[PDB]
Design a protein around this ligand. Structure first.
Ligand SMILES: COC1=C(OC)C(=O)C(C/C=C(\C)CC/C=C(\C)CC/C=C(\C)CC/C=C(\C)CC/C=C(\C)CC/C=C(\C)CC/C=C(\C)CC/C=C(\C)CC/C=C(\C)CCC=C(C)C)=C(C)C1=O
Ligand code: PCD
Ligand code: HEC
Ligand code: HEC
Ligand code: HEC
Ligand code: FES
Ligand code: FES
Lengths: 154, 440, 732
């Protein structure tokens, strides 16, 4: 029943059924509404979180699968919200409605961890799962490239 | 006729009785834990960790059971077999067993009271364990905490529940007792790897196909089998993956649970490198990897690895880059799976397993792919710290069949599978909805 | 007052010259925004307008997304791209009033006549002496208030070069959305909250519950009860809501509930049936309401039966698939029904909520939150009623009703499939259009949700403005008759809804494709043919201040496109073409003249159509927010691209066939083409920009296809299978 794991760097122990998705454990049990609910079948990426530093869909990830793991949400990406991906998102004015942008930012951070220089093909391959209904992809690509360039500067 | 047939039948019966029947060693008082030396305890701990003693001797169904207490359920095709208690319990355990009785059980599969054990207990592999290892792991077992739990009763029917006749006949037909014999044709490392792989680690227990009587087909060793719905792929030349299982790949897979090219160890192989092979000396895992690389014949098949990797990289990004208004199964795969399974660079990125190189798409059946789609992979199941969402409710049987057909056609060069929807339903019929997500 | 965006307003009272702006004693200036924040950054643009007119420092400007209050009296409507266009005059007058009060009080404090003191950057000065707005409020303590007719006569600033308008400015809501701090309707948490999930009836309308078996659901841990909704307004008939302490428990309980239904009379209606009914309706000339019917259309059409050019164009169903599923929290606290949800049209759903709850309209209040994408789906508001009814069933305790994606798609007010027939009669030379007859049959969302907002045509009969708009073209086609017919089959089967650029996304498709077809059939250049009919004479002369210049303005942007893309001397390789299409935007009253060109390569083997480049030129008057305008136009162009080539669904057994992303295929990041968007620069009255970009993308691509391989497609979306079928037919 009780599943213990490290969320945003803090150890937590959630008492919920082991079949409960990580999305509704984070949103309701832990009161972290940064993660959003989209399709619910792991095809839109709105619920993307970071398990062990890797982007994953929390909508179809059961609680029992994250026992003793390290889960990072959009609230834990940076203490002050000044992550390179977040700064590039703000400078490029990417978010229109902002519902997908938490998952989009988490997936972009994971991509930058995977490919430090995401080409167009790499961006298409990695960010293809994430869906934006407002269609901010033109700004999304530019923000990803700008964040990559800033990271290489650093 | 008459006298002749009666005489020959009596001779055969007395011979079979003499072969099958074994005397019962007199029980001994429980040995004190202080008697065994400390180093022997550690050596036995290593040996028992190698043999996965606590894997199928711990109750998993229902509530979790005590360590090494038995009562583990095995869904044998002939019935249900429940592992005996091997904790040093006085009555329901090996506490009254002596060293000779335990050694006899290890080398022949005969219990203390003389009864014959089922081949579910892989004595055909443990019979090669040397005397020193047997004594060490006996000392390790006798110092474990005692548990007074009784294993449940088996549901095996007549005429297989009769231990004497049935198990004696099975041992006569297939079992061959005897310790592993050193092969002078190979170096010490290869000999150690062969001794472990065919002995304590019993890699062929579920990697070698079995006939109708549960005996491993010695003419098809390491040819891959089906266990728990999953498929254990071949451990020899017959592996269908385009990249050869080199020594480095084997060592990485068997020690850390993830290989740079093939992928991670999921399903029934979740514990083997994680729970057991990681607690034994690194030299043993290196020897096992070297032995299997020799068996796999990697020194001859490793020439085409670079070409295979390049081809897999070419086909990995297919339909994932650029506009895709034509193929709908490709759209479904890209939306559902292509986000974390796309590779572009000359080599795969650790944490993004390459499906074009994985056995899930190159095997004869989609069993592994369907099982991975349904169950998912937990944080510590395959590669460390990283996890995989379960598509039990996200994808229906039709959608899983569509994804499997598209991946087989595109990510491999093999002919398409058959009866994908029926196989998807069969795979789904072996679990109980890991997520309450639903929300289709 | 719910959420002040940049930061919380100071708690030291304020001076309110009107109901739109307030000035705090410390200099902070709050602007009350009643438009829904569904992603268009409307609050930032409105704040820019009011601050530029007020002559105030932008760093002291905060915007409050106020809740529904009697003081604003049904001004909570956000659709049809009216936000900036309608708020221009109002916010300019409000800012002028505030600036006048500040100037007078500063002049009084400084001992000078107001005729010499000047205000800039939130400080008014008279020579050397100066005083800030906050100091003015703290010292003078003004109490003057302005009625709307008082502000209507103020000396507004010249509409020329402005200080804050048409300048780049970061949006106020983006920083919150980047760090996951923006609160949506689905993020609302109340004390004693109980989660709820519906069990969708087999049909949208006329479904009756016979029996409910909750024995299976009682074994679900956390499941509380089930409520069969009794709707006085008849908006959600035959609904059964399952309640639980946790949302997954509610989902499992709703799945495990056994409900028997009477399916209704539209259980076996398909999309082909709807299109056939539309054809039958359009066949009869007496059906429908003529938006305008010039005299002599019949005589012009029937004088020469051998010189009639007729075409028909069909558009399939499209689903919103807004990312945030429809949800709402409802409770009854302090003798008032509170509804927490994201809505686009609160003034329309408030009377319906009051009727459903059987309470006076003054006892219902809707708190406003950020919208996870409206796109016209949140104009409906039918998702708030079940939450309120479920809360009323248990005595007013909070209930958070959340719909899953399958339920959201079942309840989705999809864009009804439409069929349009255009028939023209030409002259003796077969070069000029003499008479025109336009008919368009589709579902009427306004006739269903907001019957009081129907427009009146030249026939004198009520019609849906959001089902014929875009067909009232500005071309010179002689006697023109434009007819709008309501598809009763579509209205009965499902709930027709407003999509992005409602009715302006498919009328330009048929109109521009037909114009190009007629130009090619008469051996004419489509650009010259279009420009020759932009005479701007008669009804197209244009009015003021909205459509100043008339059809000529449209021609201008078209000409601009013809210069931006090198239309005259464009040489392209084989199977490559360029297609152009123009439109006047959303409505004749508020036109946004737009033109688009698409470069398309068609694969003759697989039929795949790839857009190499997409040019857009728009004339929306003054561009209040350049970054916001560019973002809205990019989103609209991508929405049009997705509807033209990628999106699209079907109606099977009276309900939409697709239920999630496993079958629905909206546009994703790899499919984005190269887009070049340009805005015509002038000082005219601003018009809408969120919707118009969708208008021209779909026909242009189609035209480009005809210029690439020579096949004409008259159905949306244009899938590769259709191109392959057309090519195979042409091979014969
Ligand atoms: C009249 O004649 C006859 C007889 O003779 C007189 C006979 O005896 C018989 C033949 C009867 C027999 C076959 C003898 C009885 C034996 C059994 C009922 C058992 C059958 C044995 C197996 C099928 C072996 C299966 C064991 C396996 C797969 C070993 C591999 C397991 C592991 C290494 C890990 C175990 C843990 C697992 C699987 C979980 C992993 C985590 C997830 C017949 C038919 C008969 O006609
Ligand atoms: N002249 C001008 C105009 C405009 N602009 C910009 O742009 C925008 C917009 O505006 P408008 O035009 O006014 O619009 P509005 O009204 O505000 O909004 C509305 C719209 O919006 C659009 N867009 C969008 N986006 C997003 N993101 N999301 C959404 O949902 C949406 N939706 C859609 C729709 S649909 Mo109808 O309702 O359907 O019927 S209508 C609509 C703003 O913000 C501004 O900033 C400018 O600048 N200028
Ligand atoms: C799963 C495949 C097993 C592994 C790995 C090991 N054992 Fe086992 N063991 C298993 C079963 C199913 C049974 C029961 C057979 C029967 O007749 O029902 C057993 C039995 C034993 C016993 C017999 C004890 C008794 O009271 O009869 C012993 C002493 C035993 N097993 C020891 C043992 C050791 C030391 C292992 C590590 C090398 C080991 N087993 C592995 C199943 C499995
Ligand atoms: C039964 C529980 C097993 C035992 C004992 C061993 N293996 Fe196995 N192995 C098993 C399964 C069910 C699978 C497939 C699961 C998957 O998703 O990977 C495997 C896989 C391997 C592989 C991977 C081969 C490939 O992916 O191409 C290797 C190299 C392998 N197994 C080797 C191996 C060795 C050396 C073992 C003795 C220590 C061994 N396995 C034991 C099932 C079981
Ligand atoms: C991102 C969250 C993923 C999505 C979406 C899918 N997969 Fe995946 N997969 C992912 C990871 C990080 C891993 C390895 C995890 C580990 O701990 O082992 C996997 C694993 C697989 C495998 C097994 C290969 C192996 O290395 O064991 C297969 C066959 C597989 N994934 C296939 C697959 C399919 C078909 C998917 C669409 C339904 C899919 N994955 C989605 C990451 C992610
Ligand atoms: S909600 Fe998990 S990906 Fe759509
Ligand atoms: S910003 Fe509205 S969905 Fe991506």
């Amino acid at each position: 029943m009780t599943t213990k794991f490290e969320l945003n760097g803090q150890p937590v122990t959630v008492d919920a059924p082991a079949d409960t998705p990580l999305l509704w454990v984070i949103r309701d049990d832990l009161n972290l509404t940064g993660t959003k609910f989209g399709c619910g079948i792991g095809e839109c990426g709105a619920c993307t979180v970071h398990v062990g530093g890797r982007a994953t869909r929390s909508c179809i990830t059961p609680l029992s699968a994250v026992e003793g793991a390290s889960i990072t949400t959009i609230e834990g990406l940076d203490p002050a919200g000044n992550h390179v991906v977040q700064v590039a998102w703000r400078d490029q004015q990417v978010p229109q409605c902002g519902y997908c942008q938490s998952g989009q930012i988490m997936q972009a951070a994971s991509l930058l961890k995977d490919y430090p220089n995401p080409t167009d093909d790499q961006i298409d391959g990695v960010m293809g799962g994430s869906l934006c209904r407002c269609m901010t992809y033109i700004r999304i690509r530019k923000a990803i490239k700008e964040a990559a360039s800033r990271q290489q500067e650093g | 006729i008459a006298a002749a047939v009666i005489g020959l039948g009596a001779v055969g019966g007395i011979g079979f009785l003499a072969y099958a029947w074994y005397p019962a060693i007199a029980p001994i008082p429980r040995p004190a834990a202080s008697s065994f030396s400390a180093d022997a305890i550690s050596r036995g701990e290593i040996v028992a960790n190698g043999g996965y003693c606590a894997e199928c001797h711990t109750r998993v169904d229902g509530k979790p059971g005590p360590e090494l207490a038995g009562d583990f359920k095995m869904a044998t095709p002939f019935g249900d077999i429940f592992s005996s208690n091997i904790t040093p319990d006085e009555e329901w355990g090996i506490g009254n067993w002596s060293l000779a009785a335990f050694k006899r059980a290890m080398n022949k599969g005969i219990a203390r009271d003389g009864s014959q054990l089922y081949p579910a207990f892989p004595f055909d592999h443990f019979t090669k364990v040397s005397d020193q290892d047997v004594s060490d792991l006996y000392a390790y077992l006798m110092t474990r905490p005692a548990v007074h739990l009784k294993p449940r009763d088996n549901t095996v029917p007549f005429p297989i529940n009769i231990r004497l006749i049935g198990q004696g006949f099975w041992k006569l037909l297939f079992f061959t007792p005897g310790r592993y014999q050193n092969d002078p044709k190979h170096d010490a490392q290869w000999n150690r790897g062969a001794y472990l792989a065919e002995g304590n680690e019993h890699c062929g227990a579920c990697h070698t196909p079995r006939n109708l009587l549960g005996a491993e087909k010695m003419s098809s060793v390491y040819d891959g089998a089906v266990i728990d719905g999953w498929i254990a792929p071949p451990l020899n030349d017959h592996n269908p993956t385009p990249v050869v299982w080199t020594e480095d790949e084997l060592f990485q897979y068997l020690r850390f649970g993830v290989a740079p090219l093939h992928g991670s160890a999921a399903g029934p192989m979740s514990p083997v490198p994680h729970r057991f092979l990681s607690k034994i000396p690194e030299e043993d895992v290196h020897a096992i990897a070297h032995y299997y690389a020799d068996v796999d014949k990697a020194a001859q098949r490793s020439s085409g690895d670079q070409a295979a990797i390049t081809r897999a990289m070419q086909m990995s990004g297919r339909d994932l880059t650029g506009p895709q208004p034509l193929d709908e199964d490709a759209r479904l795969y890209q939306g559902a799976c292509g986000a974390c399974h796309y590779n572009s660079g000359p080599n795969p990125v650790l944490g993004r397993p390459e499906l074009a190189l994985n056995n899930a798409l190159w095997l004869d059946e989609p069993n592994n792919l369907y099982q991975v789609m349904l169950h998912g992979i937990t944080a510590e199941e395959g590669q460390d710290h990283i996890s995989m969402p379960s598509f039990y409710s996200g994808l229906s049987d039709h959608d899983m069949a569509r994804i499997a057909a598209y991946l087989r056609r595109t990510r491999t060069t093999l002919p398409p599978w058959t009866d994908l929807e029926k196989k998807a339903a069969s795979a789904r019929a072996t679990l109980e909805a890991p997520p309450v997500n639903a929300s289709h | 007052a719910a959420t002040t965006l940049p930061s919380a307003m100071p708690p030291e009272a304020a001076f309110e010259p009107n109901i739109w702006c307030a000035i705090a004693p410390d200099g902070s200036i709050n602007v009350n925004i009643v438009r829904a924040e569904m992603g268009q950054h409307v609050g930032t643009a409105l704040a820019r307008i009011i601050a530029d007119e007020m002559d105030a420092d932008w760093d002291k400007i905060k915007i409050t997304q106020v809740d529904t209050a009697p003081k604003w009296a049904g001004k909570y409507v956000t659709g049809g791209s009216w936000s900036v266009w309608d708020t221009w005059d109002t916010f300019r007058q409000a800012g002028a009033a505030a600036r006048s009060v500040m100037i007078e009080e500063g002049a009084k404090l400084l001992g000078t006549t107001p005729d010499r003191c000047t205000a800039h950057e939130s400080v008014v000065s008279a020579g050397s002496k100066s005083i800030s707005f906050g100091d003015i409020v703290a010292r003078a303590k003004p109490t003057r208030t302005f009625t709307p007719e008082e502000m209507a006569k103020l000396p507004l600033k010249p509409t020329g070069n402005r200080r804050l308008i048409s300048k780049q400015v970061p949006a106020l809501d983006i920083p919150d959305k980047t760090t996951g701090k923006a609160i949506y309707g689905i993020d609302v948490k109340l004390d004693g909250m109980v989660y709820g999930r519906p069990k969708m009836p087999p049909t949208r309308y006329a479904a009756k519950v016979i029996s409910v078996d909750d024995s299976a659901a009682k074994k679900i841990p956390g499941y509380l009860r089930y409520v069969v909704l009794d709707d006085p307004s008849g908006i959600v008939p035959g609904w059964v809501v399952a309640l639980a302490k946790t949302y997954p428990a509610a989902i499992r309980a709703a799945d495990a509930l056994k409900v028997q239904w009477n399916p209704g009379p539209t259980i076996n209606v398909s999309e082909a049936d709807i299109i056939e009914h539309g054809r039958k309706l359009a066949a009869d000339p007496k059906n429908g309401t003529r938006v305008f019917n010039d005299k002599g259309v019949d005589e012009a059409l029937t004088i020469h039966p051998g010189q009639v050019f007729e075409r028909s164009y069909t558009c399939a169903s499209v689903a919103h698939y807004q990312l945030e599923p429809v949800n709402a929290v409802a409770r009854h606290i302090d003798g008032m029904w509170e509804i927490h949800t994201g809505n686009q049209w609160q003034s329309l759903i408030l009377p319906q909520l009051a009727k459903s709850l059987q309470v006076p309209e003054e006892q219902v209040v809707m708190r406003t939150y950020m919208l996870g994408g409206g796109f016209g789906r949140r104009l409906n508001g039918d998702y708030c009623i079940p939450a309120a009814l479920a809360s009323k069933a248990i005595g007013g305790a909070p209930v958070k009703l959340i719909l899953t994606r399958s339920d959201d798609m079942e309840l989705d007010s999809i864009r009804s499939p439409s069929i349009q027939t255009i028939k023209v009669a030409l002259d003796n030379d077969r070069k000029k259009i003499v008479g025109m007859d336009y008919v368009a049959v589709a579902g009427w969302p306004t006739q269903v949700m907001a019957p009081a907002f129907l427009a009146t045509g030249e026939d004198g009969k009520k019609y849906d403005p959001f089902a014929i708009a875009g067909a009232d073209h500005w071309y010179e086609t002689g006697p023109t008759r434009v007819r709008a017919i309501s598809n009763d089959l579509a209205n009965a089967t499902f709930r027709p809804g407003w999509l992005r650029s409602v009715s302006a996304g498919w009328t330009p498709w048929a109109l521009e494709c037909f114009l190009d077809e007629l130009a090619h059939s008469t051996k004419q250049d489509p650009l010259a043919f279009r420009l020759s009919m932009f005479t701007a004479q008669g009804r197209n002369a244009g009015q003021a201040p909205n459509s100043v210049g008339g059809a000529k303005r449209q021609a201008a942007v078209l000409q601009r496109l013809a210069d931006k893309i090198g239309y005259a001397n464009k040489q392209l390789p084989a199977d490559t073409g360029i297609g152009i299409a123009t439109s006047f935007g959303q409505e004749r009253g508020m036109p946004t003249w737009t033109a688009a060109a698409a470069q398309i390569h068609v694969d003759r083997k697989t039929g795949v159509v790839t857009c190499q480049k997409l040019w857009l030129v728009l004339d929306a008057g003054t561009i209040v927010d350049p970054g916001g305008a560019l973002a809205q136009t990019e989103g609209a162009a991508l929405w049009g691209f997705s509807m033209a080539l990628f999106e699209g669904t079907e109606i099977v057994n009276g309900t939409i066939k697709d239920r999630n992303l496993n079958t629905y295929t909206p546009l994703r990041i790899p499919d984005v083409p190269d887009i070049d968007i340009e805005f015509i620069q002038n000082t005219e009255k601003p018009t809408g920009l969120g919707e118009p970009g969708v208008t021209v993308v779909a026909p242009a691509i189609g035209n480009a296809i005809f210029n690439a391989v020579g096949i004409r497609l008259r159905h949306m979306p244009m899938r590769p299978a259709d191109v392959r079928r057309e090519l195979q037919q042409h091979t014969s």
